[PDB]
Amino acid sequence: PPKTIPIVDISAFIDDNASAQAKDDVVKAMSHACSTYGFFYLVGHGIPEVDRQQVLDCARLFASLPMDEKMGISVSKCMGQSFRGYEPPALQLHQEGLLPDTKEAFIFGREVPADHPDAGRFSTGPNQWPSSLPDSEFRIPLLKYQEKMVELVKVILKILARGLPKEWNCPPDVFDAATVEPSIPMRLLHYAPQSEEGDHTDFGNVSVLLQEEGTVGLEVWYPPTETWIPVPVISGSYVINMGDMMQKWTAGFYRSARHRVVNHNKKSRYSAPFFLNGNIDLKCKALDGSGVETVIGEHIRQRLFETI
Amino acid sequence: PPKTIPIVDISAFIDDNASAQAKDDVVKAMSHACSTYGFFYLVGHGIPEVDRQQVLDCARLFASLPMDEKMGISVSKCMGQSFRGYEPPALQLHQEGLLPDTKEAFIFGREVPADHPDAGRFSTGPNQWPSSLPDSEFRIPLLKYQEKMVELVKVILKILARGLPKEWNCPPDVFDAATVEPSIPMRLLHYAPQSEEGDHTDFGNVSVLLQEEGTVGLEVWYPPTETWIPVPVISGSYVINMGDMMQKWTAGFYRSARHRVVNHNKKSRYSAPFFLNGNIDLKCKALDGSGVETVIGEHIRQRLFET
Numbered sequence A: 001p002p003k004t005i006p007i008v009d010i011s012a013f014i015d016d017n018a019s020a021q022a023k024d025d026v027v028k029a030m031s032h033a034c035s036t037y038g039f040f041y042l043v044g045h046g047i048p049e050v051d052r053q054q055v056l057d058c059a060r061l062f063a064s065l066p067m068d069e070k071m072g073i074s075v076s077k078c079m080g081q082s083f084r085g086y087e088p089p090a091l092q093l094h095q096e097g098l099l100p101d102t103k104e105a106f107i108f109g110r111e112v113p114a115d116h117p118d119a120g121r122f123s124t125g126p127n128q129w130p131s132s133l134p135d136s137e138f139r140i141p142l143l144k145y146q147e148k149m150v151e152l153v154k155v156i157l158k159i160l161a162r163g164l165p166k167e168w169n170c171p172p173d174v175f176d177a178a179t180v181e182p183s184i185p186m187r188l189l190h191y192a193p194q195s196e197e198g199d200h201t202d203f204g205n206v207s208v209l210l211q212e213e214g215t216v217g218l219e220v221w222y223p224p225t226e227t228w229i230p231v232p233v234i235s236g237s238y239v240i241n242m243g244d245m246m247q248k249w250t251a252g253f254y255r256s257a258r259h260r261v262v263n264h265n266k267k268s269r270y271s272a273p274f275f276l277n278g279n280i281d282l283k284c285k286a287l288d289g290s291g292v293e294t295v296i297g298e299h300i301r302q303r304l305f306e307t308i
Numbered sequence B: 001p002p003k004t005i006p007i008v009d010i011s012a013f014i015d016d017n018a019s020a021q022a023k024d025d026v027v028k029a030m031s032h033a034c035s036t037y038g039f040f041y042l043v044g045h046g047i048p049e050v051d052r053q054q055v056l057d058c059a060r061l062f063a064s065l066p067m068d069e070k071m072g073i074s075v076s077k078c079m080g081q082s083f084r085g086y087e088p089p090a091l092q093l094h095q096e097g098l099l100p101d102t103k104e105a106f107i108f109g110r111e112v113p114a115d116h117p118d119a120g121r122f123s124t125g126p127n128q129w130p131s132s133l134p135d136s137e138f139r140i141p142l143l144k145y146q147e148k149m150v151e152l153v154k155v156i157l158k159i160l161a162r163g164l165p166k167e168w169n170c171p172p173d174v175f176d177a178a179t180v181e182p183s184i185p186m187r188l189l190h191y192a193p194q195s196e197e198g199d200h201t202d203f204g205n206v207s208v209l210l211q212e213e214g215t216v217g218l219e220v221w222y223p224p225t226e227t228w229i230p231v232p233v234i235s236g237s238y239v240i241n242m243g244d245m246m247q248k249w250t251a252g253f254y255r256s257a258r259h260r261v262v263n264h265n266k267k268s269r270y271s272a273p274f275f276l277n278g279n280i281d282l283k284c285k286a287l288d289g290s291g292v293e294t295v296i297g298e299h300i301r302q303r304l305f306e307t
């Protein structure tokens, strides 16, 4: 029974002067992690720690807005199925903060203008922005960080493509089309402390989680030993996991693991997960050459219906 | 057969506003790592990445001096048994660089003046500094870095003291005496590439290794499955391990593991290990109350003779 998910240092891939052996070491480590656990810690991404800390400060800043202003940009008010804006807690009584055991989030994605023909299509459309926060303090750092998440998931996909079974003869670009005009939702999550008194998989391709220091929140189901693996916070790391669409694309070689967040917090906790769903119109062919075709957006919408 | 040594984030101990649960989590993780493997990765130390990169640049800078300049401060020339200065390769033919499969090092420790009564005693005395390297590029950043390593091993020892068996009833200060006027050698290591064509334990209390990015060098012997565990470089981390004197002090609860560096390098590789040996005159009592008394310096010298 494993005690931890593995860790992958991708430095050899962020620098063009690393040895072929070191790059190959990264490829094998990430391939084994994603085909065994579906999860791994990633370090060596090169995203400055000040930027990560700024993202968590944005989460805290948004959460500090009064309930009325956050509901002014409720996801109810977004365009079509773009699912952008404020996700309210399940219960609320006051304008300030959260009731214990609830959570709230700000969701934003790829900026698509309202008059674009795709606006309002699944996970596609304009973002909603809280007007009381100045651009320099919220929207601008979040969009800059979004640039960096897009570049990081591109690198992750190149490493993963190099890690597939060689007899499938997949080229290292095999995933690249998913990164063109993609669905890329990001959440700024605020978890209230636990009171004194869930199980899921991600549907997309790659998830990149920024954790705040604190007690263990995340657990990953490992079927072979039927155990929940805790994922404590590791300084400098992201938690990376594969989603259902990636598992489907790779005919099950890369696993999409069940996971849940446990709330042992005595104070409010924040996190910032970024999700690569991918281009919602891309038709993906099973990389084992079995001829199965899956359209990303149809797959994700189907997963939503099956889970709700 | 384990595949990795554990990772311990000590952030909860570098901040006084972290929860008691988080601090206890750090204590438990570090204790289990040191009593099982004797080794762990440490992150969250707060030492800036620019400072770590500078230390490795100092290693490269020193190594780039010609043989004649480096031998000007050979360890042969240090005062008494202070063991400070330049450790030359086992073989050499040119003034520049190293022959494959060899290594060289710069060694410096706690600055003790030449007229101090302890100067020249075991691992104690003044440092040798290469006269061709400007202070701002070498001696000054290394001495500041040395302060940061001393503070980090102080934190590690506090965590380790909290991880001992509760039935021994050890107080959390139990190791602190080792950090007063200690032997603290640090090396700037330069490994030549492998040619086309060792196994040991550390003698002191706590070792703190800064690795350079590259292929796996370090391996740790794990007896229960009789396997060499690779220790690849992890960004932002130090590799921490217990030495023989910590194993002795804790009556074997904390393990001093055998380890070795393997050379798969096609180009020169650098590292910066810092060693807490401790105060050489401190008499340590086995923390299980078995009455055994060990003087750190005598232990380290005896371990040197045994090897």
Ligand SMILES: [Cl-]
Pocket (backbone or CB within 6 Å): A007, A008, A009, A010, A025, A026, A029, B232
């Ligand atoms: Cl790695």
Ligand SMILES: [Cl-]
Pocket (backbone or CB within 6 Å): A232, B007, B008, B009, B010, B025, B026, B029
């Ligand atoms: Cl930890």
Ligand SMILES: [Fe+3]
Pocket (backbone or CB within 6 Å): A200, A201, A202, A259
């Ligand atoms: Fe998830």
Ligand SMILES: [Fe+3]
Pocket (backbone or CB within 6 Å): B200, B201, B202, B259
């Ligand atoms: Fe060693």
